[PDB]
Design a protein around this nucleic acid. Structure first.
Ligand SMILES: [K+]
Ligand SMILES: [Mg+2]
Length: 208
RNA sequence: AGUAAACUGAGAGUAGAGUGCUUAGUUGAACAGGGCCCUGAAGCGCGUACACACCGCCCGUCACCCUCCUCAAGUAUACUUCAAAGG
């Protein structure tokens, strides 16, 4: 790293800095006075103070990026969000008043809940015992659960089954299925859970 | 981590010649959390028939061979004893 270890990570929250001083705890006050004496890294070119900034979508965009082409990756993301919004508006317009209440038209809400539905609660770790590898059910950390949901979604959309279907069309369709607890990505989560339940007796092989 | 990845120039050398080499720049990620289970390191121990130093050393049969010895049906040769006796 070109930054020395002293450099601290920039905090980019408008509301944090505007917080009234009176509400600050004694520890919080110390943290603020200390920061004034500390070197800070230049803010990266990705995250900003914009009210429209979504960290999860930014991470998903980077996972889609190929060869540093963030412009193309970002184009695919915004096309997907627009495609989802247009599909829900069509479904909303063709629905009855009672049905219209239950139709979600916010693409960010759909994107967040579709990925949450794909997150696996339990994982499998290969453990070598007596020269034989065993798939052992293990608890997954929160970061790994979220990462796996995104990787499965992107891997599914990149699968060759989809013939001459552009990514925004494929991704929007898959996100809407997962939002409704359907589709192959949800099936991949269920398979992992079923495999871990079958191997529940091997859980003792784990030593942590 | 301006790393990987992708993309774009230049240079060395030739008369000419590389999909090679050297080098400048552009866009620009993901994971970094657990573990000692597998490999390896350090500290402190233990063991050791190794010192060419475990790619070490080393045991037995089988095969092949030289010397010596033992057992052994017979057969052959030499050697010891008889009188230190009795009628
Ligand atoms: K031998
Ligand atoms: Mg050996």
């Amino acid at each position: 790293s070109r930054y020395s270890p002293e450099f601290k990570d920039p905090l980019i929250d408008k509301e944090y800095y505007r917080k009234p001083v009176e509400e600050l705890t004694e520890e919080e006050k110390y943290v603020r006075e200390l920061k004034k004496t500390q070197l800070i890294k230049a803010a990266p070119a990705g995250k900003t103070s914009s009210v429209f900034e979504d960290p999860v979508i930014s991470k998903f965009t980077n996972m889609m990026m190929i060869g540093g082409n963030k412009v193309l990756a970002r184009s695919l993301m915004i096309q997907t969000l627009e495609a989802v919004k247009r599909k829900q508006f069509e479904k909303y317009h063709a629905a009855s008043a009672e049905e219209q209440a239950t139709i979600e038209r916010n693409p960010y809400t759909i994107f967040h809940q579709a990925l949450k539905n794909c997150e696996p609660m339990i994982g499998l770790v290969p453990i070598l015992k007596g020269g034989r590898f065993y798939q052992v059910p293990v608890p997954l950390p929160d970061r790994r659960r979220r990462f796996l949901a995104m990787k499965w979604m992107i891997t599914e959309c990149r699968d060759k089954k989809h013939q001459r279907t552009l990514m925004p069309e494929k991704l929007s369709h898959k996100l809407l299925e997962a939002f409704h607890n359907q589709g192959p990505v949800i099936k991949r989560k269920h398979d992992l859970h079923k495999m871990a339940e079958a191997n529940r007796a091997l859980a003792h092989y784990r030593w942590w």
